[PDB]
Design a protein around this ligand. Structure first.
Ligand SMILES: [Mg+2]
Ligand SMILES: [Mg+2]
Ligand SMILES: [Mg+2]
Ligand SMILES: [Mg+2]
Ligand SMILES: [Mg+2]
Ligand SMILES: [Mg+2]
Ligand SMILES: [Mg+2]
Ligand SMILES: [Mg+2]
Ligand SMILES: [Mg+2]
Ligand SMILES: [Mg+2]
Ligand SMILES: [Mg+2]
Ligand SMILES: [Mg+2]
Ligand SMILES: [Mg+2]
Ligand SMILES: [Mg+2]
Ligand SMILES: [Mg+2]
Ligand SMILES: [Mg+2]
Ligand SMILES: [Mg+2]
Ligand SMILES: [Mg+2]
Ligand SMILES: [Mg+2]
Ligand SMILES: [Mg+2]
Ligand SMILES: [Mg+2]
Ligand SMILES: [Mg+2]
Ligand SMILES: [Mg+2]
Ligand SMILES: [Mg+2]
Ligand SMILES: [Mg+2]
Ligand SMILES: [Mg+2]
Ligand SMILES: [Mg+2]
Ligand SMILES: [Mg+2]
Ligand SMILES: [Mg+2]
Lengths: 46, 260
RNA sequence: GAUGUCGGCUCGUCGCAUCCUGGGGCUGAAGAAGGUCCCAAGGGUUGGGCUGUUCGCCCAUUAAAGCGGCACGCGAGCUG
RNA sequence: AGAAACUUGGAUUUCUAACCUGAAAAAUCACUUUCGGGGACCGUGCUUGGCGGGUAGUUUGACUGGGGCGGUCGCC
RNA sequence: AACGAUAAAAGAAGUGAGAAUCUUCUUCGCCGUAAGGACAAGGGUUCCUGGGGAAGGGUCGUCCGCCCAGGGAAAGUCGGGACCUAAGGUGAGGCCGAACGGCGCAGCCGAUGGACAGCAGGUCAAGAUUCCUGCACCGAUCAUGUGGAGUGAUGGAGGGACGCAUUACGCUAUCCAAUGCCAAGCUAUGGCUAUGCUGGUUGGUACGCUCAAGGGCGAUCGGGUCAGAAAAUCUACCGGUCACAUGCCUCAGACGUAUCGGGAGCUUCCUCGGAAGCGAAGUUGGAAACGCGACGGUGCCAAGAAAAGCUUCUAAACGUUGAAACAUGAUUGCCCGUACCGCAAACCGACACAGGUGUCCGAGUGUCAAUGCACUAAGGCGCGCGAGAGAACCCUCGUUAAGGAACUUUGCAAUCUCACCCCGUAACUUCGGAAGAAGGGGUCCCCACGCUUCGCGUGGGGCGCAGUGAAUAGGCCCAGGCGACUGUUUACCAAAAUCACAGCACUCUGCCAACACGAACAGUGGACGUAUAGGGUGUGACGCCUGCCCGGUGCCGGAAGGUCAAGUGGAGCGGUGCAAGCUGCGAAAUGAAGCCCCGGUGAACGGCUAAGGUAGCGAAAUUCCUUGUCGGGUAAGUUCCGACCUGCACGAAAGGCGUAACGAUCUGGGCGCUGUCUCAACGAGGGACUCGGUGAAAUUGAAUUGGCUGUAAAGAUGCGGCCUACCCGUAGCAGGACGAAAAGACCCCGUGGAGCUUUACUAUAGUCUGGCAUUGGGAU
RNA sequence: CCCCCGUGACAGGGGGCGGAGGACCGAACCGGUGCCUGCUGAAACAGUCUCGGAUGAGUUGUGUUUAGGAGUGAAAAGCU
RNA sequence: GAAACGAUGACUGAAUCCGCGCGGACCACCGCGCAAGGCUAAAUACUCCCAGUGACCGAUAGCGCAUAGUACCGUGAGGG
């Protein structure tokens, strides 16, 4: 039973990363939306 | 001829001589552009490289050459002939039927109508049979590079020569284009029986998949209980038999009696 | 806002319009073997071939190889 | 009733400065080009009509001794 | 109910408030191509020390991967960065786009790969090509001296540089044998007194005329300018010369000497346990890699990265008295990762989860071989509930009288069968196969002889019920239906007669190809392919073959006429004003594809009034009547095989009829063999039961919850009459409580939905076509 | 490829050698044939036994590309 | 629709003061206006934030929160 989650550092950093949210504005949208979300923690500190 | 095999579940092969392996670009396999898959299948292969090969053969004009070896390379389906010139420059060309190893090949407008020689159509004799023809002066040869193919000469116009393309189509090709004497040898590919399933794979991926296997979602022929279908059409409902897919164009008046 | 449905297997139990066995009347019942009707439900009612089949056909038997009910008895018992 | 002449239009034909377009040391480009070919077409912009399950939105009645099928919907 | 695998544990000893569980000893069973060891990913102090006992641990707990605190992780050389590039990402300029944005040459990023300087040991409680000891090596800056003169670029060239299978030779790791060498000692049980027993038996560096299989290299003069943009002494060439086998170059690895290590043990001290000191021999014989020598050899078709470092050559520049090169000291080595887990108690799975996870090493004995099988070494572990009982039932195994498929939907299941050697082996056949067809026989131990190696054959002899003596280990055959075949498919009820498949056919496409993605005269895929190509379609090896009918539908071709849009054109009609004039509608002709119309096309949809079945086949995967009728087998045969023809409703590439081989396919039969069965029995183990510890769940109107008859919304414990019945439990069984579970998936209803289809409606991408625009000139 | 034998329409036949394959048997590994056990189970798809492929259309790591009327699909309306 | 007028996408493309646009097809009168050039607080909207009050809540209310977008769930967006 190979599970859905197969942790890869360089992956979770390539997709989802702050630098990753940089390239597009859907992700910068996500950023500011998250900042106001309460003080959440945006992806790559987690 | 061809190679054959005793009964182990087999038929044919080809026969390849003159071994070298020399000096050319890599290439990668892929089936599509920025998006999803365009041209269906052919995602397999033996990881061929590419041999940049001269077609136009202009700048070697006036300079003779000797055939070095004849190597059989993919992305071609033709014999590749190696050339060495008097310049010291080596170059690749296609290898017409019956070209021995180490004959003499010369380019230019002055050249003699012998095997492998490059020279424009205006000099090409009446009824002669040649391959590797440009549609336009310069660029390269888009005509008669394939398996066992050739094009003959049907007459002259002004700048134009009437040529016979190997669908059996008559066309007007101007005499300002270079051409290469002879038919591309290629043995005969129609011979080789391509073995069994996966002999495909050797050169390219999983072949025809019948839309009638598919489902209404997938293709038109899809759906139903049984083996059948009604209205006869492709991915998009154009249809295969006898529908001209051509458009009204420029070279269309540079074309005469296309029938078949 | 659920009463699982054919057939089998397992377990039974019940009715009698009785297939056997028991008691009788009549007989176109000499005897033997029967045909029919009346009383009788204690017990008994075989093994195989084909078919998913109950039914049915056939093999070899037998005192006989009974008919129905029990949600066409039985899946919180089995099969499927 | 001949025609010099500016001619406004349609038809085949031809030309080259538009435009497309390949070669050359300068790979996509731009450049000067010898240029080479195509060329008033093709492309593309507006409009015109056709075609168009490829796609898209929807329609597909009721009665009915369950529904369907058959039948029946008004009037005397 | 359970406490998460049936790999069992036992005693003593210790500690403590308390021990089945923590510590130690001694035994026991278990893995050992692992259940040992090393890494990667990922986890994040889980490591070590000293504590701790709440919770976490399926019981316990003095214990732990839990809690607290402290410590521990060292690099010029290993892996990465300061180097290079692949897919991909990116991208000034550049090409597009209602926006946000999509592209894109160079360049750049990007290891999974290229390049690149050390090895051997020691050791803290916890690090080691990192620290220390021994001896290395690389680049850099500079100093004495040699030389005593050229260095020789973002540019050229060379080279990096690459497949698969198979294989000759030499060697090592490494393992095996021994009356080799060394060391220690005693050994009794009946013997052995060593010829027994146990353990150990070279790693690095250096020189050396030693030994060595294997491995790859031609050298210089010169010529043409047209070749490497230019240059050149470098490279590519055509030529001349000397080189055929000797020849050169390097030596994996062995040998000797040296030397630094290590080494069985050994001695001393012991804070009760480790420290510290010492140190023997290193042989002969055999086996042996997927590693090394190497970029080896031969063959094959599908024809097997790039780029830097690097080697040579010039351009430019500075210098040609103080160059490049060498060794000879010195100085110099920046950044990040190194603990621990890492086939799992620490990663992904809520869990201390029977699952999952890529690479490396993986010993010995027996066995043709082996990573197989059994047992074992080093190493690791007995699975964090126990203990008793020996009922039903349940699971997993063992044996079975007589019978042997009578069981059943079906031999489902489970036997039988089994390895290697010898002999032997059918129809049919694509001459490969069928085949391991079918059968039959051998198998152990000792002795002599022989032999081509482990061993093997021959002869003789011995033992047992039996000698692949235990483990690994095909039952077989005769007929068919389907598909040819290997293969592929429904992650979680369907592996097939599906899909694919080689082969065959129709058709499209002349190359900014048709065709497909796309806000787009961008770009890209087809393809760096070009008409024995590329697309779409349908058939499905192979063999014999593929018939009749185009009326209707699509499709290509045609041209007499019919109909038709915008538009060009404008007869005429009207409003208004005194008019000039401004204005509402408006025809005839002329105007394109298009459809009607003529023809043709079926391996185009399609048919058996367009004709209506050519072969081949037929009660078939199509057959209704139907268990059709004869036969075959059977004691009996609704299935199966064969034959007939009345084919309800076979039939020729939605292919027809055949076919050897193949098949975890489907169907019928036989042999073999069996607990499938008559008909069950005994035996084992794991649950079930009992005691101590931890302790859930679905369900639940409330219940103080019987039977038969009846009655009620038509199936009564709860209504009636009659019967039965002391209170409460435990092990059991499954009839009832219309028992539980999911607001039935069937069915109907809803002017509820969504997928799909089309000659239902409607729009539209797309595409075609007339006009106008870019868009201009002349002959005519 | 090297030797022995055979061409009356007939082919190649025996030996030596070589190492071919969508060849065989079979562990890894990849896969799921049949029965049983299991039914919040050890497990939200397994376990034992049996079975299939086992040099090929093979298996697998890393980096990456493709997606909602959309992708992907040796084609179940499967997978995303 | 009798559809005027503003507004552009494509073809077209006038006047200029005895002139031009309008007044809901259009005409004439009659009026109203002078386009193709730009800027221009104020009165209007909103509440991250500060103050004041309330026939607003008072711990299942009141914001999600008597502070936490934390724990916790998800690859993520997101939820909480
Ligand atoms: Mg289908
Ligand atoms: Mg469709
Ligand atoms: Mg269809
Ligand atoms: Mg019943
Ligand atoms: Mg109705
Ligand atoms: Mg346990
Ligand atoms: Mg044990
Ligand atoms: Mg063992
Ligand atoms: Mg506890
Ligand atoms: Mg010894
Ligand atoms: Mg455990
Ligand atoms: Mg072993
Ligand atoms: Mg028996
Ligand atoms: Mg017996
Ligand atoms: Mg039977
Ligand atoms: Mg029976
Ligand atoms: Mg069986
Ligand atoms: Mg098949
Ligand atoms: Mg299955
Ligand atoms: Mg036909
Ligand atoms: Mg019969
Ligand atoms: Mg198969
Ligand atoms: Mg009571
Ligand atoms: Mg009461
Ligand atoms: Mg009562
Ligand atoms: Mg029970
Ligand atoms: Mg219920
Ligand atoms: Mg309902
Ligand atoms: Mg379907």
């Amino acid at each position: 039973m190979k599970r859905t989650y197969q942790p890869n550092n360089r992956k979770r950093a390539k997709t989802h990363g702050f630098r990753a949210r940089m390239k597009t504005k859907s992700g910068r949208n996500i950023l500011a939306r998250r900042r106001a979300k309460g003080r959440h923690q945006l992806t790559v500190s987690d | 001829r061809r190679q054959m095999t005793t009964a182990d579940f087999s038929g044919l092969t080809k026969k390849r001589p003159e071994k070298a392996l020399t000096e050319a670009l890599p290439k990668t396999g892929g089936r599509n552009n920025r998006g999803r898959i365009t041209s269906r299948f052919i995602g397999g292969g033996h990881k061929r490289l590419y041999r940049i090969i001269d077609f136009k053969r202009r700048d070697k004009s006036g300079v003779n050459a000797k055939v070095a070896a004849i190597e059989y390379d993919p992305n071609r389906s033709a014999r590749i002939a190696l050339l060495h010139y008097a310049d010291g420059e080596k170059r690749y060309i296609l290898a017409p039927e019956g070209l021995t190893v180490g004959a003499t090949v010369n380019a230019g407008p002055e050249a003699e109508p012998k095997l492998g020689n490059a020279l424009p159509l205006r000099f090409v004799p009446v009824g002669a049979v040649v391959h590797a023809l440009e549609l336009v002066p310069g660029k390269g040869a888009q005509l008669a590079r394939s398996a066992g193919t050739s094009v003959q000469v049907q007459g002259k116009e002004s700048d134009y020569v009437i040529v016979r393309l190997p669908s059996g189509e008559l066309r007007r090709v101007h005499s300002e284009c270079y051409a290469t004497i002879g038919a591309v040898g290629n043995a005969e590919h129609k011979n080789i029986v391509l073995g069994k399933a996966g002999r495909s794979r050797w050169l390219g991926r999983k072949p025809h998949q019948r839309g009638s296997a598919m489902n209404p979602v997938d293709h038109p022929h899809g759906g139903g209980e049984g083996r059948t279908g009604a209205g006869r059409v492709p991915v998009t409902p154009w249809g295969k038999p006898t529908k001209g897919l051509k458009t009204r164009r420029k070279r269309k008046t540079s074309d005469r009696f296309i029938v078949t």
